C-alpha cells in the first residue's frame, strides 16, 4: 500500500543523456521502450535527470541539485579553485522547485548514478564544511547545497552501481576501451561514431572544462580530444571515482543518511570456470562487454588492492561484489532484504542475472521482464513510510 507521494527521479551512469537527445532513444529503456513513460502511465510520477556522464560525482551532484530546484549550477568556490574549472555552470528553471518547499523524491540510479545519488544526499543533509569555510575566508557566496539541513531525498535505489569501484578501470588500455564502450552505446542507439553530426545528438555537458563537440566533428575525433583533456586526466572525474581507489575515497565521506531508505540491486552475467575459478561472460551478454570487458573483470586479481576471487563475478562492466552497497572505506550498514524496507541502511535487494546494459534495456534480453521489474520497484518505493 502507498504510504508516500514522493516523485521518482531517474539518474544515469557514465553514459546517459536527456529524453530529447540521441534522437529520442532512451537511456532508461533503450531498445525495450521508455521506462519513465511506463511508470507515469501506471500512476508513478517520474522524471529524468541528465548530468555530465564523464564528470565527477561531485560535479554531477551539483548539476542534479540545480536541475531539480532550479538556478545556476554552482560547483563551489573551493572545489572549482582546487581543480581549475569554472565555478558556475548551466542555468535551469528547475524540474521540481517545490523541493525547496517540502516535496520529496525517490532517486533511481544506474551504475555510477548510484554514487552521485548518495553524494547528493550527503551534501543535502550535511553540506560541505570545506566550502562553508572557504566562502567565509574569501568573502564569496555559498550555494545552499553546501549549507546542510536540506532533506528532500526519501530514498536512493542503486542498480548495478560500483559502490566499491570497478576493476575495469585497472585494465591496460582502459582509456581506449572505455571510449570504445561509449561508441558501442552510441551504436546501440543507431548513432555512428564516424559521422559529422551537426545536431548535438549527445551533449557531454562539459561546460565547466570548456569542452564541447564542434558541429560537424565526429564522435571519433571528439573522443580523441576528451582522452587528452582534464575530464580524463584529472582526479575530478568519473574515471577517478569509478576506480577501486577512488570509490573508497568517496566512501570515506559519503555516508548513509539516517533519513533516507537505500535499496541496492546487483547484476551478474557470468559463469565460473571449474578449473580456473575465473568468471566468463554468458550467452546473451552485450557483445562489446563480452569481448572487451568481461574477460578482464572475471580474471583480474590484485592482492595489493584486496582484489580476490570474490571480485570476479561481474555484469560485464562492474564487479558484482561492489554493488550491494559501499563497503571499502565505509561504515554504512548493509542488510539483506527481509520484506520490510529500513531507513539509514542499505536494503540489499539481491542479484539479478542480467547484464549492465540489459538492466536498463539498452541491450535486449527477452527473458528479463524489464517493465515488471521497474513497476514492482515503483510500487515498493510508493510503499515507503515517510
Q: Which residues are at the interface with Cl ion (CB under 5 A)?
A: 243-245, 364, 366
Pairing between β-strand 279-281 and β-strand 270-272 as defined by DSSP bridges: antiparallel
With b for 16 or more beta-carbon neighbours within 10 A and e for fewer, the 145-181 pattern comes to bbbbebebbbbbbbbbbbbbbbbbbbbeebbebbbbb
Distances (CA, A) of 357 to 182, 324, 368, 379: 12, 18, 12, 23
Q: Which does 270 bind (CB under 5 to 8 A by kind): Zn ion, Ca ion, Cl ion, none?
A: none
**Alpha-carbon span 212 to 13, nearest angstrom:** 19
- Whichever of 25 and 261 has its CB closer to Ca ion, that residue is 25
| CA-based nearest residue to 238, from 204, 266, 274, 272 | 204
Backbone angles phi, psi at 66, to 5 degrees: -70, -35
Helices (H), 20-160: 35-41, 57-69, 77-83, 113-126, 129-138
- The three-point CA angle 160-366-115 to 5° equals 10
Enumerate residues 6+ apart whose C-beta is below 8 A from 306.
328
- Whichever of 157 and 286 has its CB closer to Ca ion, that residue is 286
Q: Which does 330 bind (CB under 5 to 8 A by kind): Cl ion, Ca ion, Zn ion, none?
A: none
Q: Which of 236, 355, 358, 363 binds Zn ion (CB under 5 A)?
A: 236
Would you say 181 and 362 are in contact if contact means Cβ atoms under 8 Å apart? no
Binding mask 193-232 for Zn ion (x = CB under 5 A): ----------------------------------------
173 is in an annotated binding site: no
Q: Which does 244 bind (CB under 5 to 8 A by kind): Zn ion, Ca ion, Cl ion, none?
A: Cl ion
Q: Which residues are marked as active site? A: 111, 315, 356
Would you say 128 and 31 are in contact if contact means Cβ atoms under 8 Å apart? no
Distance in Å, CB of 19 to Cl ion, minimum: 21
Distance in Å, CB of 269 to Ca ion, minimum: 8
End-to-end CA distance of the chain: 13
- Whichever of 247 and 359 has its CB closer to Zn ion, that residue is 247
Q: Binding of Ca ion at residue 103 (CB under 5 A)? A: no
Q: Which does 236 bind (CB under 5 to 8 A by kind): Ca ion, Cl ion, Zn ion, none?
A: Zn ion
Distance in Å, CB of 58 to Zn ion, minimum: 5
Reduce the DSSP state of residue 9 to 3 states and report it: strand
Reduce the DSSP state of residue 314 to 3 states and report it: strand
Which range touches Zn ion (CB under 5 A), out of 52-60, 101-109, 122-130, 312-320? 52-60
248 is in an annotated binding site: no
Q: Which of 257, 293, 363, 380 binds Ca ion (CB under 5 A)?
A: 363
Which range touches Zn ion (CB under 5 A), out of 235-243, 289-297, 308-316, 331-339? 235-243
284 is in an annotated binding site: yes
| Residues between 251 and 310 with contacts to Ca ion, criterion CB under 5 A | 284
- Whichever of 59 and 363 has its CB closer to Ca ion, that residue is 363
Matching residue, cell 580530444: 225
- Whichever of 226 and 285 has its CB closer to Ca ion, that residue is 285
Q: Which residues are 348's β-sheet partners?
A: 264, 336
59 is in an annotated binding site: yes
Binding mask 55-84 for Zn ion (x = CB under 5 A): ----x-----------------------x-
Q: Binding of Ca ion at residue 365 (CB under 5 A)? A: yes
Q: Binding of Zn ion at residue 241 (CB under 5 A)? A: no
**Alpha-carbon span 358 to 267, nearest angstrom:** 10
Binding residues for Ca ion, rule CB under 5 A, total 3
84 is in an annotated binding site: no
Displacement of CA 35 from its chain's centroid (Å):
16
- Whichever of 9 and 159 has its CB closer to Ca ion, that residue is 159
**Alpha-carbon span 265 to 259, nearest angstrom:** 20
Binding-site positions for Ca(2+): 284, 358, 363-364
Binding-site positions: 59, 79, 85, 236, 284, 358, 363-364
Interface contacts to Zn ion, rule CB under 5 A: 59, 83, 236
Binding-site positions for Zn(2+): 59, 79, 85, 236
Amino acid at each position: 500500500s502507498r504510504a508516500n507521494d514522493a516523485p521518482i527521479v531517474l539518474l544515469h551512469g557514465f553514459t546517459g543523456w536527456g529524453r530529447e537527445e540521441m534522437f529520442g532513444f532512451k537511456y532508461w529503456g533503450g531498445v525495450r521502450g521508455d521506462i519513465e513513460q511506463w511508470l507515469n502511465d501506471n500512476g508513478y510520477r517520474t522524471y529524468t535527470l541528465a548530468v555530465g556522464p564523464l564528470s565527477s560525482n561531485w560535479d554531477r551532484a551539483c548539476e542534479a541539485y540545480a536541475q531539480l530546484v532550479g538556478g545556476t549550477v554552482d560547483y563551489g568556490a573551493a572545489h572549482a579553485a582546487k581543480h581549475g574549472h569554472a565555478r558556475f555552470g548551466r542555468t535551469y528553471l528547475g524540474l521540481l522547485p517545490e523541493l525547496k518547499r517540502g516535496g520529496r523524491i525517490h532517486i533511481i540510479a544506474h551504475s555510477q548514478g548510484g554514487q552521485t545519488a548518495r553524494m547528493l544526499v550527503s551534501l543535502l543533509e550535511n553540506g560541505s564544511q570545506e566550502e562553508r569555510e572557504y566562502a567565509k575566508a574569501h568573502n564569496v557566496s555559498l550555494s545552499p547545497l553546501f549549507e546542510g539541513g536540506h532533506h528532500f531525498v526519501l530514498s536512493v535505489t542503486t542498480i548495478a552501481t560500483p559502490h566499491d569501484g570497478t576493476t575495469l578501470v585497472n585494465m591496460v588500455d582502459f582509456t581506449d576501451r572505455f571510449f570504445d564502450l561509449q561508441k558501442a552505446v552510441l551504436e546501440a542507439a543507431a548513432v555512428a561514431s564516424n559521422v559529422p553530426y551537426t545536431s548535438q545528438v549527445y551533449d557531454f555537458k562539459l561546460d565547466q572544462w570548456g569542452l564541447r563537440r564542434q558541429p560537424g566533428e565526429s564522435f571519433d575525433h571528439y573522443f580523441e580530444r576528451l582522452k587528452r583533456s582534464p575530464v580524463w586526466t584529472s582526479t575530478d572525474t568519473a574515471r577517478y571515482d569509478l576506480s577501486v581507489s577512488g570509490a573508497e575515497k568517496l566512501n570515506q565521506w559519503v555516508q548513509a543518511s539516517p533519513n533516507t531508505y537505500y535499496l541496492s540491486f546487483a547484476t551478474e552475467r557470468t559463469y565460473r570456470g571449474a578449473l580456473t575459478g575465473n568468471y566468463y561472460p554468458e550467452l546473451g551478454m552485450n557483445a562489446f562487454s563480452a569481448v572487451v570487458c568481461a574477460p578482464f573483470l572475471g580474471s583480474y586479481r590484485n592482492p595489493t588492492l584486496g582484489i580476490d576471487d570474490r571480485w570476479l563475478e561481474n555484469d560485464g562492466i562492474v564487479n558484482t561484489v561492489s554493488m550491494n552497497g559501499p563497503k571499502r572505506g565505509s561504515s554504512d550498514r548493509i542488510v539483506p532484504y527481509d520484506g520490510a524496507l529500513k531507513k539509514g541502511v542499505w536494503n540489499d535487494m539481491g542479484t539479478y542475472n542480467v547484464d549492465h546494459l540489459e538492466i536498463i534495456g539498452v541491450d535486449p534480453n527477452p527473458s528479463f521482464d524489464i517493465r515488471a521489474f521497474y513497476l514492482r520497484l515503483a510500487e515498493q518505493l510508493a510503499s515507503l513510510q515517510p
